[PDB]
Amino acid sequence: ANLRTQKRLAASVVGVGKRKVWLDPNETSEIAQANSRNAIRKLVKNGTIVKKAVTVHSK
Amino acid sequence: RNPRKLKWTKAFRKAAGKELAERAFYKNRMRGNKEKDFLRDKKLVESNPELLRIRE
Amino acid sequence: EYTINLHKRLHGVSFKKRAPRAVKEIKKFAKLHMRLAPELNQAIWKRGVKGVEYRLRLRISSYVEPVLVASA
Amino acid sequence: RVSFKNTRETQVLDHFNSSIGRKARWPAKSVKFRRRTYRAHGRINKYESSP
Amino acid sequence: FMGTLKKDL
Amino acid sequence: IAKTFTVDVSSPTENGVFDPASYAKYLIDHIKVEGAVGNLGNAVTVTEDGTVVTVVSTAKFSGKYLKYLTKKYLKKNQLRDWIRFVSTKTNEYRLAFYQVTP
Amino acid sequence: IKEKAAWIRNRQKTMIAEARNRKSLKNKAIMPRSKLTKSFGKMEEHMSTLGHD
RNA sequence: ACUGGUACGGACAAUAUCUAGCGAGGCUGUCUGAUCAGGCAUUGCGUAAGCAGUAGAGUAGCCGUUACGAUCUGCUGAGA
C-alpha cells in the first residue's frame, strides 16, 4: 500500500498536477498493481482515478 | 451621553410609552400581538405547499 | 445523543490549540459516559484552530458522530 | 541498544536518580527489553550509546 | 421596579 | 429566427419521480424575458407533451439558461443529486440518472 | 395552523444549517457527481422520504 | 457614443518545568455569488434574525396611480 508512484503517474498522464488527482481510497489493491502508464490510463477510464475540477472561485 | 436615547435608561422608557407615567398597562401595550403572529403563520403556511407535503 | 458544552472545557486553553484539544475532549467525553467520524472532525475544524463553538450535539454508539440540528 | 542506567533500575507501560520528578519514572524502552557531530565550530563532540 | 417582562406574560 | 429546444424527461417520469407538467409550469413562470419574469409576449412558448418539453423562442434564449432553470427546478424538488440535465444533439437534451451501483 | 408554521420555520433553519455544514472554508477542487458513483440504499431512502414510489 | 473635468456650495486630507526517546455591542479592510452567519488582520480598532407599516433620502410606471428602496417605528430591556 504505497501509491506514491501511482499518484505521480496519474498526475503526469492527466496533466493536472498532483493537487488535482483523486485515487479511490476503496481501490488501493487495484491501484497498487498499476505500475505502468497504460494501467493508469485504464484506471482513469474505469473511474478508479478521477481528475478534480478547477476551484469555482470568482476572478 | 444622552440618557433619553439609550434604551435601558428609565428616561427613555418614560419618554417613549414603555413605562407608565402596571401589569394591565403592559398588557395594553402588547394587544394585537397574537393576531400579528397568526397572520404571519397563515402567510408562511400558505407560501410553502411543498414543505407541507414533505411534512406529511 | 448527548450535548457537549465545549465552552467550559476549552476555557483557558490557548487560542492556537482550541480545535485540536476539543478533539481530545470529545474522546474523553465518550470515555466518561461509555473513534471519531471524519464528519465530526470537520464539524470541529469548521472554523480553524480558533474554532469550536460553545455547544455541540453528538450521537455516541464507541462511535461518535455529529448530528444535524437547528440549534444546540 | 538500551540505556544501561535505566535498564539497571528496571502497568508501567500505561502509567542514577538525578533530576527525576517526584523519585520514580516509566522507562518504556528498558521495560520492553558511536557517532560524532560538530558543535561550537571546530570542536569535536563524540556521542556514544551506552548498551 | 423592572415591571413586566416578556416571559412574565 | 425562432429556435427550438427539446428536453426529454421520459427516464425520470417512467420511474415516478418527476412531473413534466410542473416542470413546464416552472418554465413558463420563470423564463424572465427582457429581465422581467412573466414577460412572455408570445416570444417564448413552452409545450408539454407528456415526455418531451418543447421551448420555442424568438427572444434571447440559450441552452445554458434552459439548463440553469432545469437545475434550479431540480434543486427546489431536491433531486439535484440524482437527476442530471445532459445534451445528446445540438439543442436536444434529456434528464438522466447518475451512476448507481446495483 | 400555527403548528405548521412552526414546523416550516424549524425545517428552514435546519436546511440553512445543513447548507452551511456542507459549505466549507476557502474553496478547493470539486469532485463532479458524474464521475463518482453512489449506492442504491441511499437513493432508495431519499426517494422514500421524498414521497415517491 | 453617454466620457468626464469645471467653477461653486459643505467636512477629511500625512518563555521557564515534568514526561517517552536521544545524549555531551459597534466600526475599518478583506473572503465565502448577495442577505443571514463566520474566517483573517497577534482582543485589527445593550434591543437579535425575520417581517410588517403607507411613514420613508432616493430609483423607476401615467399627465388618482406599477414596482424597488436607503433610513424610522412596532413586534423587542428583546436576543446572546
Supply database-style keywords.
part of a larger assembly, 7 chains, D: 51 residues, 2 helices, 2 strands, 8% strand, E: 9 residues, little secondary structure, 0% strand, elongated, RNA-binding, ribosome, DEAD-box ATPases
Task: Please describe what this structure looks like.
- It is classed as ribosome.
- The entry lists the keywords ribosome biogenesis, DEAD-box ATPases, nucleolus, ribosome.
- The entry is titled "State E1 nucleolar 60S ribosome biogenesis intermediate - Spb4 local model".
- Chain A is 60S ribosomal protein L19-A.
- The organism of A is Saccharomyces cerevisiae BY4741.
- Chain B is Ribosome biogenesis protein RLP24.
- The structure is cut from a larger assembly and holds seven protein chains of seven kinds.
- Chain A has 59 residues and is mainly alpha-helical.
- Chain A has a single domain, classed as 50s Ribosomal Protein L19e, Chain O, domain 1 (Orthogonal Bundle), CATH 1.10.1650.10.
- Chain A contains three helices and two strands; from the N terminus they run αβααβ.
- Chain A has a two-stranded antiparallel sheet.
- In chain A, helix 1 (4-14) crosses helix 3.
- The longest helix of chain A has 11 residues, at 4-14.
- Chain B is mainly α and 56 residues long.
- Chain D has helices spanning 4-9, 28-32, and strands at 35-36, 46-47.
- A two-stranded antiparallel sheet of chain D has the order 1-2.
- Chain D has 51 residues and is of the alpha+beta class.
- Chain F has three helices and five strands.
- Chain F has a five-stranded mixed sheet with strand order 2-3-1-5-4.
- In chain F, strand 2 and strand 3 form a beta hairpin.
- Chains in contact: A-G, B-E, B-G, C-G, F-G.
- Chains A and G meet through loops of A and loops of G.
- Chain D binds one RNA strand of 80 nucleotides through strand 2.
By DSSP (H or I, 4+ residues per run), the number of helices of chain B equals: 4
* Shape summary of chain B: elongated
Helix percentage of chain B = 55-70%
Number of helices of chain D: 2
Q: What is the percentage of strand-forming residues of chain D?
A: 5-15%
Evaluate the radius of gyration of chain D. Answer: 15 Å
Number of strands of chain D: 2
Alpha carbon gyration radius of chain B = 19 Å
Task: Tell me about the largest β-sheet of chain D.
Answer: 2 strands, antiparallel
Please tally the β strands of chain B and state the result.
0
**End-to-end CA span of chain D:** 5 Å
What's the SSE pattern of chain B? HHHH
Shape type of chain D:
elongated
Oligomer: part of a larger assembly
- The portion of residues forming beta strands of chain B comes to under 5%
Structural class per helix/strand content of chain B? mainly alpha
> Distance N terminus to C terminus of chain B?
56 Å
Could you describe the largest sheet of chain B, including whether it forms a barrel? none
- Helix/strand structural class of chain D: alpha+beta
PDB class: ribosome
Keywords: ribosome biogenesis, methyltransferase, ribosome
Entry title: State E1 nucleolar 60S ribosome biogenesis intermediate - Spb4 local model
Chain A: 60S ribosomal protein L19-A
